[model samples]
Target: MEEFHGRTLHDDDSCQVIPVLPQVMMILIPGQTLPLQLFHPQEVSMVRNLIQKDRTFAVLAYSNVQEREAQFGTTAEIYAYREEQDFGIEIVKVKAIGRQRFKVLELRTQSDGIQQAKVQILPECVLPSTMSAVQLESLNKCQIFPSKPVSREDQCSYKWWQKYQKRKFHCANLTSWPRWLYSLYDAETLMDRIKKQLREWDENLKDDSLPSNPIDFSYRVAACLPIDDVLRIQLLKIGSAIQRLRCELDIMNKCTSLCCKQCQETEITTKNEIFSLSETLTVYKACNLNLIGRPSTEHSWFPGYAWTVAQCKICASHIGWKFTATKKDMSPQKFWGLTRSALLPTIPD
Candidate 1:
């Protein structure tokens, strides 16, 4: 085991290898929690041992059911579990939260016949020094500043004290502070697009939760996105928060343009609507749209409508849908419903 800046890094041998069933398929990210039902004898045995011991395991990515090894995975810790009796049979369900990312280097089977991997824990992505003077400075100011004023008295009191004490400040908008202090409060000369786009992101996504650091923000955004597994795989491998944020920003900017994925020529959203399915269920709806792909009956939130899976004309991806009314004389007839999973939520014009 090795450490840098207090984050744990692991070599294949230094890592503690907890035996997990080989080639389990699940895409997980930090701060995300999942639930699993354990019915298999081997899985159940692993759970019992985990509870008694470290209570940690790696959820490996399965290439296919035929594959015997996994390349990448997330380290998960059991959060909660319960045993239930069904048909006089005892069942175990466990809730787990993903903590860190790992990549497999070696694989071996235990005496009990369960396979596990010796893995390397990936480091948290930091704002890289490879950035230009301006870019690097841009990241520096975007940090958790001390809440109170820096004073000469406090500076003299503590030997370890830097100019500023660590605390939380309402620096959500730098301009909110006095103009005279703008020079002092400003983290950097922010790109007009970055601040405007960032504010648009908050308003459009309605996210009040602001992470103090870019690394946490990037991970949370990636985890919550409705992207496909392939896109997720791409993001998981990126080791720089700036790189990840830039990539995501590009994806979002394109989505906001709202063009057909297939043609790239046709315009999509003419106007948007809001629909109330019931007291509890409401969706952001759009109308006057053209979609190229066929409808899919896979899933639908509304009872009377079957969600038609629509795709981009040029590049096939789930952009939005034509939610068709199933019943007779449905007030809407049929309208388009775009999933936030598909849109970047007002990234930029």
Candidate 2:
């Protein structure tokens, strides 16, 4: 039987302190990969020191130039790093993967000039299995035994069972149903909606590559979604995977258009235009963007395509880029890349 539960970190006073790395216009979600290029002397020194230790640090999002920090953030562990000297400038390029969500309880400036925080680890609340007898009874009614060999038809029926349970769970009084019902049935429904969105974004995505754990799945969706940082931070703040999934579903449904963050009046593109060019860069077809300068192949996000700076028509802000195919036979001859920082989600009227 597949393991439905896994061990996670819990709130404790002993190991809650970590160094903080505050960033503007960026929020890291658990299970997401963040590539950072560090040039500042203090940051370079800090990363170098972390390499000798646990290599974990907190990533907090700053709201403005005045340094308004979000109370919640994620802990990122450095998995890879390299040092290089460019024109007398020392740089460290580090690749880190987010680990867990944390809520800041206290912030203190260290002697080295990096901020450290005392945090509370937010773990997913898995429903207790005290009512497993009732759950097994319902599962037996649908012949969905964990020990039995799963078949294609059985999987289909299993989906139907989930849907039926969802309606029954929602319609009945919350106190009447077993708590596991919400964790299993309701979460599965939200997962299905997010999975459908993922498939639409990238048809080539294989089922095996997707995380089966609800906590990881929710973070993966939050990281990949093209929503602005404001919404992204909100997802990071949520402690429960089911609640986070529901919040993401609402954002996905309500955000129909992407507008300029600076002006908000100029619409760059709609949500349906969004597509993933690669795992790192998500692009969308834009109708109201102005392309500036010639396309350059240097460090292009998409290999066979060159990118040009794309700006908003009205505000002229650097929204994203226009990627054009270098050769004639390439598919998706052209597309627009909008930076998440410059995007503002708009609900349809």
Candidate 3:
């Protein structure tokens, strides 16, 4: 799809995973970011090296058939990195969010110490990375090349458009900037929103628990929403602050105005957000509508990473989706004055 320079893109072809660990398995789409919790010994070391030295790493999508020998993979930025040690018990671990995308070129296994596969990384789409206005929402995550560019009115540059039942939202392109949106909203604000929406609903939202990606703080909003996979995929495809905000607004509007009785009265719930997304590069990848991996099992995949769910409803089959504590919300925490606490007892060591 696209590549970030001089970095590691996760691949399964040559990965050395023989027996898959219970750690988070990754299957990143071109524009989607994955939230992961790395507790395995190798992952801890692997993260530090990637962030500090190389800023390169890969998230290989594992399959149930091969599982431990997963071959599907994508390369991404290890955005946040942290470890929680309760008297040296390694109680909690976290990694900052990063974004990268790769296409499955080929799966390979070599006859050496190095187990490796080859993949291509997607370059950043030529859009301003961040936007605040609502007017910039015309760009679709699927259609990256041409769209009406937003001209800021007041200060909010976020814009929105609709494709059939699906809505398109976008903002100015923001590249190579850290915590750009977080600065506007800040950590406490993020936590307040997340806690209010997620925890109040009894949706298995763990505030103190860390998410795997930076966007988790916001996208969890989507997971908690009552929309279907298509709506969720639309949210995932939204690549900028403008787009994201517009999406929330659309969700709000739909729930309030367009929704049937239940959603109108209840706050829409969405999780499984808070990861990075890339603009679709190739027609083949886009038309096929694939995801990094499936969530039901290690080797499984949802429509396309999370994009399938995020598709604009109405334009497609808009149905309420199933929810799980794990699939809906997986972005790495370490955002908004957050401290991650893993509930699972048998986290691999």
Candidate 4:
């Protein structure tokens, strides 16, 4: 029988399919983990198939392909997935882990033999990134390339190294950091600051109207300039109130203080190692001085927290989140009163 078309589940000889209306770009890179959430009826059927069979599919973006799955699509594989019958999603999720590249030959109602459109698969080998290794190794040994803060005189010796370091920082932000940083940005200054920083980016990001709040606006402008996701994340968290926003600043400062020499040689490593990650984490005991790992609306949260320095997990609720200020004094609200009846016992570490 011909493959059922028009938004329903179907299968193929080589792979299961998630039919997407590919008007948008599919930026899945090879060897990277891409989360695949199947919503469409046909795509739901696709997931149902993958769950039944322990088979992996490819995530293919249109390179030189002719007919797209639904215009343009990438090859993807469902690796680790989950299924909940009650929750809204109809099918089990198959996290599509990217493997290699492919060109779409055809996207027809039927999966004919020619479906695997003869792709011009070229051998473009990512050279395991050599220079990144050398620069990191150099830093690991002495922290800084010249073994001191970068200066104009030392530029000659560390020219290439500095460039490599910047790239590494960029890579870290893109790959590892939490996505909340993206949302935290003070968008008010995004347009203006971006144009100012890039000069040419001005055309794309200019406006005449004044922002509602300039302080928050400036912090966002600060975010756009760095271009590093990690740094952008850092700025979003730290904002303008350096002293008032000390909890966030403390985290950013910890990230900034990453002396390459101290990082690799000592306990800290340059934003790469899990050990480095462990040291930077703020926990329950996180110096009041901290924002305990409170829950947020983010779909995926970094699990398994161990806060050696637990800050008042509740303070962020009070301070920034505007969680009703603690009712320490009953005078403010007659209905509220401190419990002396041997409460949960505010235990201290």
| TM-score to true structure, per model | 0.53, 0.61, 0.31, 0.28
- Could you give me the TM-score of model 1 versus the true structure? 0.53
Lowest lDDT block of 10, candidate 2? 1-10
- Give the higher-TM-score candidate: 1 or 4: 1
Candidate 2, residues 105-222: lDDT per residue as tens digits?
Answer: 7888888777889888777566432334344444445533343233446744566555555544432343576644564435655776677665544554436676777777787778
Give, for candidate 3, the lowest lDDT window spanning 10 residues.
Answer: 337-346
lDDT of 1 at 195: 35
lDDT of 4 by residue, 1-349 (tens): 1121122222222333333323224445433456655565655665566455633444444333354332223345556666555456564455555443344444444352213333322222222222243444444443333332333476333555445345434333535443233222323223323333333212232334223344433433443332323333233323133221332332333442111121121211122221212201211111122333443323322232211122223322211210112235422111111111111111111
TM-score, ranked from best to worst: 2, 1, 3, 4
Candidate 2 C-alpha error for residue 106, in Å: 1.3
Residue pairs whose backbone atoms clash in candidate 1: 261-315, 262-312, 262-313, 262-314, 262-315, 263-314
User: What residue runs in model 1 are displaced by over 4 Å at the alpha carbon?
Assistant: 1-14, 21-24, 63-69, 111-113, 128-207, 254-349
**Who wins the TM-score comparison?**
2
Which candidate tops lDDT? 2
lDDT tens digits, residue span 202-259, model 3? 4352535535333554454554455544454455545544445445644643432111
What lDDT does the true structure give each of the candidates?
A: 0.55, 0.69, 0.37, 0.34
Whole-model alpha-carbon lDDT for candidate 3: 0.37
Q: lDDT of model 3 at residue 156?
A: 25
